[PDB]
Design a protein around this nucleic acid. Sequence first.
RNA 1: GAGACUUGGGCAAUGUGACUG
RNA 2: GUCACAUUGCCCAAGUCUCUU
RNA 3: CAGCAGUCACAUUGCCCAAGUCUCUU
RNA 4: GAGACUUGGGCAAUGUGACUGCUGAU
Lengths: 16, 1476
Amino acid sequence: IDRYEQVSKDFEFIKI
Amino acid sequence: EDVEIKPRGYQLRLVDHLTKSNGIVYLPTGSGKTFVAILVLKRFSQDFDKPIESGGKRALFMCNTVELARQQAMAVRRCTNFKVGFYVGEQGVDDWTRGMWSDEIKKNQVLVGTAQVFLDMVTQTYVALSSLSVVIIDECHHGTGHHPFREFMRLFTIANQTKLPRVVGLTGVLIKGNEITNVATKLKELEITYRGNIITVSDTKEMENVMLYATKPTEVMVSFPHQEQVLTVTRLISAEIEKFYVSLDLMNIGVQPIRRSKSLQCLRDPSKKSFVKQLFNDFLYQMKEYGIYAASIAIISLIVEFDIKRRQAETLSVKLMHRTALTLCEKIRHLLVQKLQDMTYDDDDDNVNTEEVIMNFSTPKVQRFLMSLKVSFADKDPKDICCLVFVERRYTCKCIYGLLLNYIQSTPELRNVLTPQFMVGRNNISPDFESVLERKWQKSAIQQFRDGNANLMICSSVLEEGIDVQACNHVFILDPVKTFNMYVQSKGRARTTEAKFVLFTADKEREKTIQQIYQYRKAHNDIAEYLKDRVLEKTEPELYEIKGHFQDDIDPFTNENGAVLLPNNALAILHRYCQTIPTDAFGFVIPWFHVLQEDERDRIFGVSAKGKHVISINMPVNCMLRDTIYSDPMDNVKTAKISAAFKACKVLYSLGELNERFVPKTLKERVASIADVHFEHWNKYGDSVTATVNKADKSKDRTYKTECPLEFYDALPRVGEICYAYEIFLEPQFESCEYTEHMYLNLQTPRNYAILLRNKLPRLAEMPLFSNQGKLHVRVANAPLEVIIQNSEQLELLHQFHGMVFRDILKIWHPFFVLDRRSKENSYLVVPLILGAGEQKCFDWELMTNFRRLPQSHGSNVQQREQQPAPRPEDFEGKIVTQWYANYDKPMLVTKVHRELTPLSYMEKNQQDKTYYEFTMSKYGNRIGDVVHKDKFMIEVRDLTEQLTFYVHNRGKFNAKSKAKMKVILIPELCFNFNFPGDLWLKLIFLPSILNRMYFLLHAEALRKRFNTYLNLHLLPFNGTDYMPRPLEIDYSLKGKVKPLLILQKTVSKEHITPAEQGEFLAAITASSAADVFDMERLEILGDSFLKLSATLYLASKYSDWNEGTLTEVKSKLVSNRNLLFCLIDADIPKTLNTIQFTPRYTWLPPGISLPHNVLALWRENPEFAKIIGPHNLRDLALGDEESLVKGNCSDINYNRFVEGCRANGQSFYAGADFSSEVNFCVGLVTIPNKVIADTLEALLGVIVKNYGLQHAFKMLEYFKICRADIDKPLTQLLNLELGGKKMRANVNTTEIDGFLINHYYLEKNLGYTFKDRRYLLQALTHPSYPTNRITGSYQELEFIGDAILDFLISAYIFENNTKMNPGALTDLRSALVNNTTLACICVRHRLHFFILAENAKLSEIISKFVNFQESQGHRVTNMSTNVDVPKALGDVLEALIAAVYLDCRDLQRTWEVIFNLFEPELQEFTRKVPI
RNA sequence: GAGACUUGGGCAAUGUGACUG
RNA sequence: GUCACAUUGCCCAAGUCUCUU
RNA sequence: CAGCAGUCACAUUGCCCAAGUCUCUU
RNA sequence: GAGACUUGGGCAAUGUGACUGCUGAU
């Protein structure tokens, strides 16, 4: 693998 | 603190119910459960100050951790009026005694401490359990299993089951573990544990306002992808990582102890080999989990930790492996940084480039962590940020910290607001990254967080329980939640309002995490359902519950005084006891455990134990029991192990072994051993090893009685016996001058006085007697003249002659004396001898037949002198006269006769133009009418001295008496004449000074014979011997190769043994107070030094399994003056010692004369009249002449007088007065202080070592039962006394020597003694700080014996080579020659500091600065500029190296040669001015 | 040769201070 | 192990008186 | 007595991973 | 797989004691 896979900036602090 | 401590709405009823019965409270953290515990103490504060023995009580506050112990100590000190005892291990508790514990209990009304401390306090029964009013239990949810809370709670059943202390349980979470299903099955375990009901606040809704202080935070979660993608470089680095694992498996490190799995399955690698494996496994886990940039700092941690491990490595083999690991870690760092630098070609913005490289190489989980923190903070105020971040592992904490610093620095929005911190549990990792271990930061990270310096808190599970922290505004759980209690307490750590709880979860494991969180929610909601649904009933009568719960394990053991041994605690005490054994080079100090094979169960206990495991315990090679003990049949390996340990402890204690207090068993008693192996004879005198006296000079001045010598007892002759007469020779030393004519001529005359003895005498050497004219040498006749008492009247006449001589001619008499013929103590007669037939002298019976009554001087009148015949001129030549007209009765010695002078005499200097007749008429004409015989005769006379104690050396000086003295002439008829010749009178004056040396000379001869018989010296020079005359102790203040020492030369050869001169023994007898020319004091120093050397060597040889401290503290009592006094008293010596200064006129009893026998009987046999009669009563016994010289007893009037003397003393102010000081000499009693008896003991030792050498002196020391003989072999020589072991010798072979001895020939080139065994040298050069001390020891043991060796050698050299120095300056210079500073100067001059092996911070610089100072000062001995500290180690290095040199050949001559070669300049420089 | 007597010097046994190992 | 300062005893230097003519 | 630091053994609670045994469901 | 139990490596927290090493003051 050349490099890691970037992840999306946006998300949600979903209630658990 | 404050008055706002008014209780919350719930605590009052809680403490109310806690009084009725045992209770446990379940409230969330931050609700003041500590305060309600303090309230419980307040309610139960009735009986605190009263002592236990009077019925008083106290309380006990149980704790879990030392940090929480300090926290609760602060919490109880802030708002209580009692006194609290902060008890923590590793100090005090293991060294305290019952007195200190009880005294602390007397003052402290409540105590706080960890669980095991209270376990040891209670099981060992320092105080009764009933002495505690209440017991406070923190973290009661741990009260299950083998945890110490349950172990202590077990003690309640076996103890007195009445008036039991109250127990209260406090916990934020009630259940620990994942067995949360059917929680009622878990609550009842803790309930029956404390036999108390669980209680929770019923008004939760109304009291939730207080719970706002512990508000439930909002619960959110972040999901991240967990794709299984890994970079190439990881697969590369793993290859050499596993290669290093394989290579380390092939390492050649030294031997290691037994290590294997918990259940004793196949072996496991040692700690020094598996620690690096574990560290690399953790590093790989971190790298895989958190990303490459995380590894970029994890690797730095690995290097900075392997560097510390290398620095702390003792063996050289470990250093190479750590260097290889360090190189591999450097390579890993190189690859990581190479990957990072191969990335980051896109942009030149260094801050943005660093931020984007942190974002990129980070794993998606850590990336989500980063952006979640960024969006949570978003450059808000620092005071708004207060949170805890919980991860799993310690290196995880450190790595996350290291990457978070870089991430914060890479973002200006977070640079000024985030200040992270980290700390972990007991595995204390260094909190620094770029520096070696040199940090000293007293304030812990918790204190730093409390100060507000740090805002973001990274922490492991250490902060989940117990520690109270500010109410943080956020909680981020980076790692997945795994346990219910951890989740509950983590959610409770967001204790403030508006707090946020953030959990990070994987995308592909999100559903199971949600399910698990929901399960925890249901469990937490169901925790309170058991108490809510509980039927309202007490928790008391079910004792069977506790009995069954506590009887499942192994039953305990109890004995007298209430001491109880916990079976679960047997392993610790067994290991502690087995660690006290003297280890070998690689001896194992732990029991060896070996489970028996399958078919070996029935070989011991039978077929009944097929499934029940049985294991044997193997004792170490130096245990008290060398056999093995087998376990009872148990269903599991761990229970079998604990049962075996418990049985081994029981067996050890049943022998006296296993310390009663259940301890490694061994202390002051080790001493007791040797002690009584020695001080056993103290008990018969009222003393013991533990008894000391420091008041009223008790056991310091003791009364002793004296016995006559063996040759004067029953020496009185009788009728029809062969009597022996030894004449006395007086040789004049002073020249014949005008002032010394008479003292020469009349003292050289043949007429002498001699002693009549019924026994034989040895040959007595000549001694000097100092008189006014000079010195006189006296010698006794070697061969006596045999005579026989042929008639009773002859013996009576001789005894009367003796009595009247002692009564008159010397005036040494007292009114109460009686002429003694019955008592045989020091009884003999003195008689004069004259030529009767040939050269041999027979009895001068003319003297005895005339001088029964001495001529009484009387006045003669003119009529009497007219009738008196004219005296012939020869009637006065040599006779004694005295003037009767004068009141003086003093005798007058005739010097010159006058046949050519007339009473109308010639002129004189004073009475010029005057005659003696005119002078006598003018001066004494009142009592002379006229001189009738006034023609043809006068006499020239000179007086004689009155002094008797002719011991003073300088009393005989004549420098100022050389001046002119008048010539005195008397008229004959006016002075009364004695027929006694002054020839015998002049010699007879010296008699007491003869007898008071003859006494102690016979005593010294007896002692010499005893000490020559016990040491079997009966050779030629000891039977036909000739004794050298008396020597003079001048130092009594009364006016290249080496020369072999004379003290040791008579040890390997017998020709050099000088015969023990009687003068030496006499000097050893005479104390300082005797006021004589010789003394014991000089020999005392040498004797003491020899005693010290012998004691140290003997103790270090018999007890090679002890430490130098115990050896010193035992030889102190062995050599103490208290021991020597009792030893010599046991030797019954004191009857033969010379202390008093010979006061003859008052205290020296005459030999054949003593006070009446009835007085002796009724005043010595009666204890009620032992010392009630004083000298004032004795002097009144002026008995009659027949009542004193023939009858031998007192009359009735004198009987009443001396029987009422004591009563009159008891009826006057004389009552209670001391009648023992020099007035108890009648029975021969003498008062001598212990400093005399001891000093005489080592004086005899010094004489013996001087005359017979070291070997015979050490052999004689055995006679005094101080150096007790060994049972296996009685004893051996002082040399070749085989001593050594695992502390005086290196425990490595010759191959490992050179690895510790970099240079040996370069030390040889200056020392000069080629070692044949370098182990002693290595042990002497091994400093305690060196890492080898844990397996090999230190140089202290060799230093201890080298000190004594050097001390004795220097003392002997300064003794023998300087004959006229008072012990003072002599041993004073010794101290200058044995001082630590001059030893350091010797060490630095000979450059021994190169080879000294040590590892310490100051010590590294002190030696260098001191050697530089000495080189700059030119090796100038201080015995200084800018107070430079002396390296006291170097002196101890020399003190151990001297012993190492000695032990390599066991010869003292080579040791002294080496010492002289070392010390040659100092023994020539110090002797001049002896710098003090 | 001895005592009486004072000035100072020298030596050894008790109390304090301090040094060496 | 040894030294310095305050208390008894011994032996001297100075000088004095008494005793021995 | 106090501060700081080093080495090593043993003890307890809980936790996941792998393997195996029995009861038991399938 | 549930339940009973065990083995082994692994993780975190807790605690004891032994050994020696500093530094300052008494």
